[PDB]
């Protein structure tokens, strides 16, 4: 797949003025734009291949972000009232929306989710024509809006505008965005006690972010109990990850790490060598 | 590109 996603965060700060508001845009696993109402309170480029867009684009995106911030300010007041919370506490409204392309480059699917204070609130259905309450009483405002109308405007965005511009972005940044960088792999050995050592399987400088690291033992079909770290950014646009297995000291060469990544023509197998 | 519209959330 390819995806165009935005991540919106609004945080109320009662007494200290209007809520903090941040939007970030991603094409696949590459951030390309950001808005911050505390920062130049505008949408700004965050990938090199975005820097030569006209003021028309930046003015439009700035106002869309601004308008979202203002509506999220209204939503935070509504949600405070809904959960019967104090006007003194800080609360968080999060909004995620994205469209994806299939192999053919046509619309595959869209999605939108809201969260209040880190909990699922409201989800756009897979048909994109109605909203599902995840929390009880969660809705599009019956009184001041329309479930069907809201879904329709988001559906048009996801099926049309989101797909159209995902293509424009993939073209503008194709040298980086469409390049598969396979993981550089190795295994390190770390004695932790007299009787046990940690085998750590490394994947470095890979793109995109999706990757599978599994440990197997020779003579055992099942995969072993594995410590996985969160996939982390290198800061250069590539990612890092490792999987660790605790094994008996002296028995390290009986274990294999198996690495699966889009940029690898077939799965890679590594074995620690002393 | 961002959507022009942010959904208005409600209660009940």
């Amino acid at each position: 797949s390819h995806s165009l996603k935005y991540f919106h965060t609004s945080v109320s700060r009662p007494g200290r003025g209007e809520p903090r508001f941040i939007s970030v845009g991603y094409v696949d696993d590459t951030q390309f734009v950001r808005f911050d109402n505390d920062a130049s309170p505008r949408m700004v480029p965050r990938a090199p291949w975005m820097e030569q867009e006209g003021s028309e684009y930046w003015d439009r995106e700035t106002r869309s972000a601004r308008d979202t911030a203002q509506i999220f300010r209204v939503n935070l007041r509504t949600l405070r009232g809904c959960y019967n919370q104090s006007e003194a506490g800080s609360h968080t409204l999060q909004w995620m929306h994205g469209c994806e392309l299939g192999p053919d480059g046509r619309f595959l699917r869209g999605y939108e989710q809201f969260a209040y204070d880190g909990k699922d609130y409201l989800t756009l259905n897979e048909d994109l024509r109605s909203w599902t309450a995840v929390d009880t009483a969660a809705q599009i405002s019956e009184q001041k809006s329309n479930d069907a109308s809201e879904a329709e405007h988001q559906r048009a965005y996801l099926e049309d505008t989101c797909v159209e511009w995902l293509h424009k972005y993939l073209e503008k940044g194709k040298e980086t965005l469409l390049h598969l960088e396979p993981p550089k792999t190795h295994v390190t050995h770390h004695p932790i006690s007299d009787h046990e050592a940690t085998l750590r399987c490394w994947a470095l400088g890979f793109y995109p972010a999706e990757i599978t690291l599994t440990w197997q033992q020779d003579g055992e079909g099942h995969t072993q109990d594995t410590e996985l770290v969160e996939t982390r950014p290198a800061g250069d646009g590539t990612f890092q990850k490792w999987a660790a297995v605790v094994v008996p000291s002296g028995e390290e060469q009986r274990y294999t790490c198996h690495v699966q990544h889009e940029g690898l023509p077939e799965p890679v197998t590594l074995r620690w060598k002393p | 590109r961002l959507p022009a519209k942010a959904p208005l959330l409600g209660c009940g």
Partner: T-cell receptor, first 116, second 112 residues
Framework: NAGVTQTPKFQVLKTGQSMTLQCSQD?????MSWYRQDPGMGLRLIHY???????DQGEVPNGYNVSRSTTEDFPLRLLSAAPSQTSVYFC??????????????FGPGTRLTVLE | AQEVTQIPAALSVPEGENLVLNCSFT??????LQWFRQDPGKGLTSLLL?????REQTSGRLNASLDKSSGRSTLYIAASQPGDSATYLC???????????FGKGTTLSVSS
């Protein structure tokens, strides 16, 4: 309910003078807006509010300020009156913009003339 | 932005004749379309509200239609009367869905 009230009904200003057009509504409406009406230009949005403490620029914001410290009041200030601000000024409110209860109520308007 | 046009700017019909007032808008992504009457020296008064999912709204000799996809509304005034003489203004929800954008209106004169 009085609906949307506007003062004054008529006003003359000298170029450079300041002026607050008063608007209030007693319908508890979150949504309020200011328009100017000019011949062959129609009804143009100056500023709008989606709730107490929340304001944004419309089609023609330049030369005008608004505040929304309360639900009831949405005053429009001309900071430095110019002849180009000679117009009829309408304040509007509604229960909602996106809902079935979407009826927009207008004030009687303020005829403003700015003279050198 | 959302752009609203009303054709024609001025209309003059003999009383008893059917007439259409036209409203077209550039962005079909609207929640509501609203028709208003304005008498000289007075404010606007709402005639008809049509929701995005609705196709027509009726009020006596007034029947407004909505076609979102085409971006059109037509206010049909059947058997027009001198008292219908006024300015008719069309409004749609702006792109943000936070305020109403108005067409420049049609001045209707139903001659006695």
């Amino acid at each position: 309910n009085a609906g949307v009230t506007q003062t004054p009904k008529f006003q003359v200003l000298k170029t450079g003078q300041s002026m607050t057009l008063q608007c209030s509504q007693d319908m508890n409406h979150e949504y309020m807006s200011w328009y100017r009406q000019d011949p062959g230009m129609g009804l143009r949005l100056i500023h709008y509010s989606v709730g107490a403490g929340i304001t944004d620029q419309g089609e023609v914001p330049n030369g005008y300020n608004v505040s929304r410290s309360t639900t009831e009041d949405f005053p429009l200030r001309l900071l430095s009156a110019a002849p180009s601000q000679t117009s009829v000024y309408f304040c509007a409110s509604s229960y909602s913009i996106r809902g079935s209860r979407g009826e927009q109520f207008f004030g009687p308007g303020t005829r403003l003339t700015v003279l050198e | 932005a959302q752009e609203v046009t009303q054709i024609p700017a001025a209309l003059s019909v003999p009383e008893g004749e059917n007439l259409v007032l036209n409203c077209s808008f550039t962005d079909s992504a609207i929640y509501n379309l609203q028709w208003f009457r304005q008498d000289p020296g007075k404010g606007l008064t709402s005639l008809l509200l049509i929701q995005s999912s609705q196709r027509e709204q009726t009020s006596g000799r007034l029947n407004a239609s909505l076609d979102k996809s085409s971006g059109r509304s037509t206010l049909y005034i059947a058997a027009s009367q001198p008292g219908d003489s006024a300015t008719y203004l069309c409004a749609v929800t702006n792109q943000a869905g936070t305020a109403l954008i108005f067409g420049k209106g049609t001045t209707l004169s139903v001659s006695s």
